[PDB]
Design a protein around this ligand. Structure first.
Ligand SMILES: [Cl-]
Ligand SMILES: [Cl-]
Lengths: 268, 261, 44, 190, 295, 206, 223, 226, 237, 10
């Protein structure tokens, strides 16, 4: 792996497939970003060290509704462009009357859970919620880390101890909620799926655990540690040393939580 | 700052709950950590830089100028420049008017400490720059101004006190030991008071309080600010007395935290 | 024909609202053709 | 409570001019109807005692509009008044874009032969069209219709206001009594 | 409002440049013929370059000098654009990209350079001085607004004559033209602007990392040529072999020596223009003395 | 300024309890107006309010109304621009908790307070309660839903605005003044609140 | 009086004219009908963007009033309903004022009216009728009514007047008085002596304007 | 053919049936036929057609006019075309092509030069052009150069066969010309030196308005190209 | 006492004619305020540069379907100089910086987006235009935005015949100056700015010294950038 | 039947 900066020559060999972060004049292929050189088959490319989340087909994302248009929604995913959520790509609770009252399902500012179905030519993503696991989010609170800390994995909705469930969006948009009955079904009726009301039985114990999970996710991000299901529960169990959840905001405490996770995985 | 109504309703119920459950596990009187840097602008008599936990950053520059205090009524002047906001925008004009009242040569600050001769004194130019902000920055600005005025050093006088213009030592310099005030902002969520309200906390608060503090006592200005516009509602008088007692109790901890130079 | 109340005709077409008033011999401001508004002054 | 002012209690536990407000007294809380307007009480509501506010156009209401721009497929209008079950005049200004705007699609012009409809022969810029609201649509444009006998161009001038008054002689033709020249419009039966 | 250029037109003009052809029949190094017309009043000057037409009006009023520069008169230039030069211009937007840049060039070429002797404008040292003003009216736009303005302002300042004044201590008596004849202004040097327009016949990759530079340079572009150019360079010189100012703000990156050869290219032209301006002034003065003999 | 006649630039400027009277509905271009003229033994003040709205905002998804309050120095330019916008900010905080904004979505309400007379036989503290009196009157005349009659009083730099017969506070303002005055200030301010509120209700009825 | 004028002098506008009355000189550009801005759009008829630039300095409210008066003359002259939802850019650049700009503006107004009319003629925009404008002044002690007064005469004028009349049928019928802008001290008997002689010299100007228009447009066309 | 000014008395009598052309306006209020344009009024003989030939440079879309446009935008069912700068846009439907079908859309891209005919030119609507013959040379104009010309010169070049411009140009080079009645004339030759020589000759001939000077101008321009 | 250029060849600060000022750059200085950030410390100068984007534009009207929109906002704080209470000149700086990075940033590959650049000048002392260029180049690279090459800024004054590389405030007020924006390591000039009179014959020597000094600035920037990247991948390892 | 687009000089 080689570190290159803008303007640097990556290879004089023209028998290469030009990838991202590159440009060329005749045989000379230069780098457009400051990143690392990637050689895959015949595709020479430069992986930038920084940049917004780039969506790929299959990504499990959490997004905020930005605007309501013609027959589609534009969702804030955290990338360069807004992602589109076509009216045909959502499970309505088709009739032409619903195409007008689109704000009865998702209004501006609503939080939802979706999957990247495809990508346009420009690179923006098309979303879909044609499943039970995708829909409007409630019964909790939002918080976000940089997308580089969310590792793409087989699953992205994990149930945590304390009756709390996390949704680790590939774009870095995390949603913590009370573990619903549907979330318990994930091991091996709901007419109002766009209801803006929260389950009115969220106890203070559940509310306090959401905070603790929120702080440890923030702490893992503060140490630039990759967020995983195994690390979130490890930090949550380790943080019990501190009686009050408030103590977890200080710098020394956050750096301790992250260091105790890295040094523990060194032993393991 | 945009939030879903499912987010807002969950947050408000947690904050107004007995006891208050804040989204970071904070206590109703607990402050978020901040980073402070001082003495980094050599062109100024004093400088400070504060970075809030949410990413809000503020830089303050203290500069002086000898003036005739018989014609210069105000010997302390604050200029607020908030990034991405017009200089005539309401929030800028409000904060500028508010801060000038917080300092104002004869109220919060000690005017006699700026005197040089029987005819001339120092005029202090407090310049505020908010690089990034996510909530009402009057409290963040106040803390940065406080740290800058403490790290401020002024030239040493040579000429006599009784009166030509004053003459200053070429090398030695004296520290400015004025007592700078502190401005605290509070959130009124239901029947609870919250010190140092966060962005999301202020988005659901029913009302807000701006409370000034100097020399160990509650001082003016004191305002009831609206931290939003959607969920603004009236508050009972006891909540106003509760917020003032909250400042009088926990501000000394804030002072000795800031005064650690 | 079709007639509209006075409140709408003023908005529908101000040109007709004047012509309808003048056809009746009055003005929209309810004053006579050569009548001025009454003035009242406070000085200094 | 014959009369009412904002803040005056009406009755224990909705409509326009009132709001449920929770008060405290003797230690126990209480939700009572409170008037928010100054007027008389008449389901609890308060009526003051012209106003386009309370009679805002809704699906099914008939409105008086003015054509502002014709297109090959639709006709853009602005709502000037709404018919009451009498009229309610909008106080907004047509010079600053303050009035609620609407759209009359080509297939909603008339009832018969909605596929082949020429917009240039049904409406003209400046005409006063009586239409009925189909839906609220988006925040930009209402969606109106004129597919009835009593709907269509009501008031119009020849040559887009450059000529004399034209009256609806035929349901599809407007003539001028002075000049005699006629124009083709989708008129409403007077 | 935008000027739409067809793809067939963009290709033809650029391909004609690659064949060393300019639509108006000029060569790549040919500055347009400068026509200067003088009005009845001193300071009324009208410049024409093919189809480009500008007009300048020099005026002066008595004002007070700044306390910081008490021995100095005042001088300001106004170049507000109007839709008369073409519907592409919005009415008096003094904040647009091209409007700001072009204005700063004329200010740096005439005001900042000290072409006008602001010391001679001073009447008495403490108060009272001359406040000269140069107003430019862009009448017809066929490109080259910067170069035309620079010639119009300088020709105006030289042709202009301020009224003679007699001071009686604090009394400043401004004599009218009928009483005593006016005195001309003091010009220290005559700056001339020459604007080079660059065209890239290839790609951006061959411009950043290309060995052989193939960028085409033409002098004083027309409107059609100006709209298709990929870079612009405005250089200002005087007969004293001084580079008054150079402005190449962004655009197509240009080889440094190529820009240097542009500066030396322009000096041949600013000599032709300076001598041309001075000649038309001498001819204009001789016309007024011939009518002074007939009067 | 090119859009004005400012004369010569070389010219320099020249350097040298409370009886109430309320009227409403006297301005024709707005939705609701009000006139408050207050004469006290030490100061006389007159100001006019104008409420324009609700006016629909082009493409607004806002679930409720957006209040705007501009305090102008209509002729008498006595107060600094900094403090006028601070009072305007304070006024907007009060009425954003009094106007039933949920009833006017996607629209906006703009309030103007023109000062027309102010002579004292800073001072901005005692001016705030009469703006609140006028804005509440003008909003009622404009047919805007108000949760209560918003009024206020002033005492030694402290300005308190009340609703619900003084049971709750909708605005608090304190400049200079003495220490520990709060208890006595809320008492004196509530007295002016009741006095102004009674006159305000009596104005809208008669 | 004696006026000189040109037609079609600018290349990047639909119509152009230059008008010189004594020492006053105005150049005028006209561009229309063109796509209007959203703010300017008028559904029924044509919208006018009228701009007047001073001979010296930047534009002040003085020119804003000249723009308003110029609109009052031009608006009834243009057959606006022929161009619905369109824009017309009438831009006047005053080159030499021909009068002490501090006190007077009537010579510039009268010249802008004629220049704008000529430029609208050159642009081929539909006009209901013709138009000519003359400045008039009544001199102090002589009390004479001087048509087309000089800059020196205006200094000792007790009243200044701008008269612009609408002409039809070969410039012999006066369809209307488009604008009469009288300023100064005058009486009813003076006013009608002014309007009488003013209409006579106005009728002389359209006859001269018809001649200049024909000398410029006839060589452009085929017979 | 007499010269007429706006507001002048119209010579033709109402007893004769007349078809009104450009320059003549019929008052909607007074029903009087009066001129609104200044120029030469031409009147036919026997059904009498009367119009005024007046000078103009800004084109106004009228039906049965040949015009050259430039594609500036692609919409759902039509093209947004510009026939002149700053003027209002014109609509070109996808179905307005020869052998048009709902399966094959035209291949034009933004910036292409199109030669078409005006079909619907409603004064209160967006004008429309078509690339198919109304009674059954239109289509894309590849490469070449477009020339700006006043409307009277363009009408004289298309309808008057005695206009010497096309003859003196053919006598110098072989050239392809497309004449638009909106002031745009498209020229293309085999070599760029010939196309530029045709551009310069048409530009100079448009400025003189004198027909008797076309031959001498063409001779000197092609001589300068050599 | 001090002199502008002493007979021994020493300037006011003690530099020789071909000596730069103390050059110190930093990357990722405001991660919680912008995608890319840079803190510039060239001599006494102190400049904060914030790059926000590429992101969705706020108004769908102001949006280009073919390329990204580039906006530069330069804020010169009130405390940058010896305070003045008093525009058209800052506008020239902004549109010039935009026109520069228009042709360097690959805006074509980020369509329908907007790249907002937010600059704050904390301390000013000569050659601020060159330092602004360096702050933008680093801040854009920190944002991961594709660009063809570096752009380095430098200022050179002419004292009689001797060019003085990297001028401070007093040197700018004493002699004429040239400001260069050099593309990478080439001789192509993105920005050439001769702000006052220079003799036509002595100008080529000034340009030669400026291009050479700019190349040194490029290496200094590249060096600091590779250090940051190597420290980032070493900490994560 | 007037021709518009035609090649001359055959
Ligand atoms: Cl978000
Ligand atoms: Cl600067």
């Amino acid at each position: 792996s080689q570190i290159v900066t803008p303007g640097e020559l990556v290879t004089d060999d023209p028998i290469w497939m030009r990838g991202h972060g590159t440009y060329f004049l005749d045989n000379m292929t230069y780098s457009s970003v400051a990143g690392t050189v990637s050689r895959v088959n015949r595709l020479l490319s430069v992986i930038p060290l920084k940049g917004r989340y780039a969506p790929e087909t299959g990504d499990h994302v959490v997004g905020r509704i930005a605007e309501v248009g013609n027959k589609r929604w534009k969702v804030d995913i955290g990338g360069k462009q807004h992602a589109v959520l076509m009216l045909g790509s959502v499970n309505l609770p088709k009739s032409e009357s619903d195409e007008l009252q689109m704000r009865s399902f998702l209004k501006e500012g609503d939080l939802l859970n979706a999957e990247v179905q495809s990508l346009f030519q420009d690179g923006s993503a098309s979303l879909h919620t044609r499943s039970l696991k995708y829909g409007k989010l409630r019964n909790g609170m939002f918080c976000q880390v940089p997308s580089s800390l969310i590792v793409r994995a087989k699953n992205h909705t994990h149930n945590l101890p304390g009756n709390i469930t996390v949704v680790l969006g590939v774009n870095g948009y995390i949603w913590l909620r009370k573990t619903s009955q549907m979330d318990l079904a994930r091991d091996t009726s709901s007419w109002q799926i766009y209801s803006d009301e929260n389950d009115p039985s969220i106890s203070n114990n559940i509310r306090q655990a959401i905070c603790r999970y929120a702080n440890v996710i923030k702490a893992l991000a503060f140490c630039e540690i990759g967020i995983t299901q195994q690390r979130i529960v490890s930090a949550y169990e380790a943080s019990m040393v501190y009686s009050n959840v408030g103590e977890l905001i200080e710098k020394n405490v956050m750096e301790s939580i992250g260091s105790d996770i890295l040094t523990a995985e060194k032993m393991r | 700052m945009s939030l879903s109504v499912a987010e807002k309703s969950y947050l408000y119920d947690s904050l107004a709950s007995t006891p208050s459950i804040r989204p970071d596990g904070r206590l109703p009187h607990q402050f978020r950590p901040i980073e402070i840097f001082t003495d980094f602008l050599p062109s100024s008599n004093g400088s400070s830089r504060i970075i809030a936990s949410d990413g809000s950053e503020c830089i303050v520059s203290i500069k002086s100028k000898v003036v005739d205090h018989h014609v210069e009524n105000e010997l302390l002047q604050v200029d607020v420049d908030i990034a991405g906001q017009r200089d005539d925008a309401l929030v800028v004009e409000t904060i500028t008017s508010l801060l000038n009242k917080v300092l104002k040569s004869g109220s919060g600050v000690d005017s006699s400490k700026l005197q040089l001769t029987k005819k001339y004194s120092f005029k202090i130019f407090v310049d505020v720059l908010v690089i990034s902000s996510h909530s009402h920055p009057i409290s963040l600005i106040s803390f940065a101004i406080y740290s800058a005025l403490n790290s401020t050093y002024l030239p040493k006088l040579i000429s006599a006190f009784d009166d030509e213009l004053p003459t200053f030592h070429d090398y030695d310099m004296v520290k400015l030991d004025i007592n700078p005030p502190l401005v605290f902002i509070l959130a009124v969520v239901g029947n609870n008071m919250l010190l140092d309200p966060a962005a999301n906390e202020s988005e659901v608060a029913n009302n807000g309080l701006i409370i000034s503090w100097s020399n160990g006592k509650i001082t003016s200005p004191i305002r009831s600010v609206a931290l939003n516009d959607s969920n603004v509602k009236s508050f009972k008088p006891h909540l106003l007395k509760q917020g003032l007692a909250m400042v009088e109790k926990y501000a000394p901890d804030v002072v000795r935290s800031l005064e650690n130079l | 024909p079709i007639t509209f109340p006075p409140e709408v005709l003023a908005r529908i077409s101000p040109e007709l609202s004047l012509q309808r008033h003048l056809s009746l011999g009055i003005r929209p401001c309810l004053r006579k053709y050569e009548e001025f508004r009454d003035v009242a002054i406070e000085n200094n | 409570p014959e009369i009412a002012y904002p803040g005056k209690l009406i009755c224990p536990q909705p409509g326009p001019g009132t709001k449920l407000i929770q008060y405290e007294h003797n230690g126990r809380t209480l939700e009572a109807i409170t008037a928010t307007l100054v007027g008389t009480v008449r389901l609890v509501s308060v009526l003051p005692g012209n106003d386009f506010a309370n009679n805002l156009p809704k699906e099914g209401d008939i409105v008086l509009t003015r054509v502002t721009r014709l297109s090959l497929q639709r006709a853009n209008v602005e709502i000037l008044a709404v018919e009451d079950k009498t009229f309610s005049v909008s106080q907004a200004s047509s010079d600053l874009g303050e009035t609620f705007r609407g759209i009359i699609r080509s297939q909603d012009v008339r009832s018969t032969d909605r596929d082949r409809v020429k917009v240039i022969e049904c409406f003209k810029p400046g005409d006063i069209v009586r239409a009925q609201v189909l839906s609220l649509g988006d925040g930009t444009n209402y969606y109106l219709t004129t597919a009835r006998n009593d709907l269509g161009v009501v008031f119009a001038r020849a040559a887009n206001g450059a000529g004399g008054l034209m009256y609806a002689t035929d349901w599809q033709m407007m003539t001028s009594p002075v000049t005699g020249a006629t124009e083709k419009r989708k008129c409403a039966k007077p | 409002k935008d000027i739409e250029i067809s793809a067939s037109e963009s290709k033809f003009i650029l391909e004609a440049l690659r064949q060393n052809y300019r639509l108006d029949g000029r060569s790549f190094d040919q500055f347009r013929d400068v026509e200067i017309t003088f009005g009845k009043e001193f300071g009324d000057v009208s410049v024409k370059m093919g189809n480009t037409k500008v007009h300048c009006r020099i005026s002066c009023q008595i004002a007070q000098p700044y306390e910081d520069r008490p021995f100095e008169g005042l001088f300001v230039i106004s170049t507000e654009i109007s839709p008369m030069a073409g519907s592409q211009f919005e009415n008096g937007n003094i904040t647009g990209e091209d409007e700001v840049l072009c204005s700063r060039i004329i200010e740096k070429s005439v005001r900042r350079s000290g072409a006008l002797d602001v010391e001679g404008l001073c009447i008495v040292a403490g108060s009272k001085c001359w406040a000269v003003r140069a107003d430019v009216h862009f009448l017809d736009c066929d490109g080259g607004f910067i170069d035309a303005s620079c010639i119009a302002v300088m020709a105006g300042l030289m042709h202009f004559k301020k009224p003679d004044i007699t001071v009686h201590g604090e009394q400043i008596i401004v004599h009218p033209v009928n009483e005593r004849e006016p005195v001309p202004l003091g010009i220290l040097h005559i700056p001339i602007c020459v604007t080079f327009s660059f065209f890239n016949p290839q790609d951006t990759e061959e411009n950043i990392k290309g060995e052989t530079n193939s960028e085409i340079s033409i002098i004083d572009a027309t409107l059609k040529e100006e709209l298709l150019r990929d870079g612009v360079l405005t250089v200002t010189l005087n007969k004293n072999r001084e580079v008054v100012q150079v402005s190449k703000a962004g655009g197509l990156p240009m080889d440094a020596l190529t820009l240097m050869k542009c500066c030396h290219e322009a000096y041949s032209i600013i000599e032709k223009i300076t001598d041309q301006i001075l000649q038309l002034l001498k001819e204009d003065s001789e016309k007024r003395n011939k009518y002074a003999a007939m009067l | 300024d090119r859009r004005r006649l400012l004369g010569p630039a070389a010219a320099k400027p020249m350097a040298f309890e409370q009886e109430l009277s309320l009227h409403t509905g006297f301005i024709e271009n707005c939705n609701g107006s009000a006139l408050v003229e207050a004469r006290s033994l030490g100061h006389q003040t007159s100001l006019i309010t104008a409420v324009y709205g609700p006016r629909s905002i082009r493409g607004s998804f806002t679930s409720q109304g957006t209040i705007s309050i501009q305090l102008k120095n209509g002729l008498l330019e006595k107060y600094n621009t900094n403090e006028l916008k601070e009072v305007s900010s304070f006024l907007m905080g009060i009425f954003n908790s009094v106007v039933n904004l949920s009833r006017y979505p996607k629209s906006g309400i703009d309030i103007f307070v023109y000062l027309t007379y102010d002579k004292d036989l800073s001072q901005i503290s005692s001016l705030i309660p009469h703006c609140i009196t006028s804005i509440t009157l003008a909003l009622a005349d404009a047919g805007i839903e108000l949760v209560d009659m918003a009024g206020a009083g002033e005492a030694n730099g402290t300005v308190v605005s009340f609703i619900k017969n003084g049971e709750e506070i909708v605005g608090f303002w304190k400049d200079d003044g003495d220490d520990e005055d709060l208890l006595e200030c809320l008492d004196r301010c509530k007295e002016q609140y009741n006095r102004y509120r009674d006159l305000m209700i009596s104005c809208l009825m008669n | 009086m004696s006026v000189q004028a040109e037609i079609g002098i600018l290349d990047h506008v639909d119509g152009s004219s230059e008008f010189v009355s004594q020492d006053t000189k105005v150049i005028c550009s006209v561009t229309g009908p063109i796509e209007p801005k959203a703010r300017q759009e008028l559904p029924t008829q044509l919208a006018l963007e009228i701009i007047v630039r001073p001979a010296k300095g930047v534009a002040t409210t003085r020119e804003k009033v000249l723009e308003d008066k110029l609109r009052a003359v031009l608006t009834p002259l243009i057959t606006r309903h022929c161009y619905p939802r369109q824009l017309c850019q009438i831009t006047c650049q005053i080159l030499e004022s021909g009068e002490d700009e501090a006190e007077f503006s009537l010579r510039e107004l009268s010249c802008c009216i004629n220049a704008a009319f000529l430029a609208l003629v050159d642009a081929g925009i539909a006009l209901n009728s013709m138009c000519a404008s003359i400045p008039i002044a009544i001199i102090k002690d002589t009390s004479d009514i001087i048509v087309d007064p000089t800059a020196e005469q205006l200094k000792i004028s007790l009243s200044v007047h701008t008269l612009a009349l609408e002409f039809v049928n070969g410039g012999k019928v006066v369809k209307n008085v488009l604008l009469l802008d009288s300023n100064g001290d005058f009486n009813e008997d003076q006013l009608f002596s002014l309007l009488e002689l003013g209409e006579q010299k106005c009728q002389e100007l359209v006859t001269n304007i018809r001649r200049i228009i024909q000398d410029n447009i006839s060589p452009r066309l085929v017979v | 053919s007499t010269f007429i000014f706006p507001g002048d008395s119209f010579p033709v009598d109402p007893t004769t049936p007349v078809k009104l052309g450009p320059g003549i306006y019929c008052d909607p209020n007074t029903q009087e036929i009066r001129p609104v344009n200044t120029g030469v009024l031409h009147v036919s003989a026997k059904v009498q057609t009367a119009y005024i030939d007046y000078s103009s440079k800004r084109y106004i879309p009228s039906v049965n006019d040949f015009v050259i446009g430039v594609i500036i935008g692609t919409f759902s069912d039509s093209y947004k075309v510009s026939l002149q700068n700053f003027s209002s846009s014109v609509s070109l439907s996808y179905m307005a092509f020869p052998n048009a079908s709902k399966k094959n859309r035209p291949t034009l891209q933004v910036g292409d030069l199109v030669y078409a005919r005006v079909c619907t030119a409603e004064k209160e609507l967006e004008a429309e052009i078509e690339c198919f013959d109304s009674t059954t040379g239109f289509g894309i104009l590849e490469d070449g150069m477009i020339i700006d010309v006043n409307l009277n010169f363009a009408r004289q070049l298309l309808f008057n066969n005695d206009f010497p411009l096309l003859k003196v140009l053919a006598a110098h080079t072989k050239f392809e010309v497309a004449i638009g009645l909106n002031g745009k004339i498209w020229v293309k030759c085999e070599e760029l030196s010939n196309t530029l020589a045709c551009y310069r000759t048409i530009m100079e001939c448009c400025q003189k308005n004198d027909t008797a000077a076309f031959k001498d101008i063409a001779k000197r321009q092609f001589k300068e190209i050599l | 006492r001090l002199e502008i250029y002493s007979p021994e060849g020493l300037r006011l600060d003690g530099r020789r004619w071909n000596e730069l000022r103390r050059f110190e750059s930093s990357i990722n200085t405001h991660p919680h305020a912008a995608d890319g950030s840079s803190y510039m410390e060239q001599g006494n100068n102190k400049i904060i540069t914030l790059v926000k984007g590429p992101k969705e534009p706020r108004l769908k009207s102001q949006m280009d379907t073919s390329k990204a929109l580039l906006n530069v906002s330069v804020n010169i704080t009130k405390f940058s100089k010896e305070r003045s209470k008093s525009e058209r000149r800052v506008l020239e700086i902004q549109t010039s910086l935009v026109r520069m990075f228009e042709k360097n940033v690959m805006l074509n590959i980020y369509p329908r987006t907007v790249i907002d650049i937010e600059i704050h000048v904390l301390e000013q002392d000569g050659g601020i235009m060159g330092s602004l260029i360096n702050g933008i180049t680093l801040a854009l690279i920190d944002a991961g935005i594709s660009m063809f090459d570096y752009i380095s800024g430098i200022s050179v004054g002419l004292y009689d015949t001797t060019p003085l590389l990297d001028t401070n405030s007093l040197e700018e007020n004493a002699m004429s100056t040239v400001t260069l924006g050099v593309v990478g390591k080439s001789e192509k000039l993105s920005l050439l700015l001769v702000e006052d009179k220079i003799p036509l014959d002595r100008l080529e020597n000034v340009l030669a010294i400026g291009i050479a000094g700019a190349h040194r600035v490029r290496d200094l920037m590249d060096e600091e950038l590779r250090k940051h990247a190597q420290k980032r991948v070493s900490n994560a390892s | 039947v007037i021709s518009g687009r035609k090649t001359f000089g055959d």
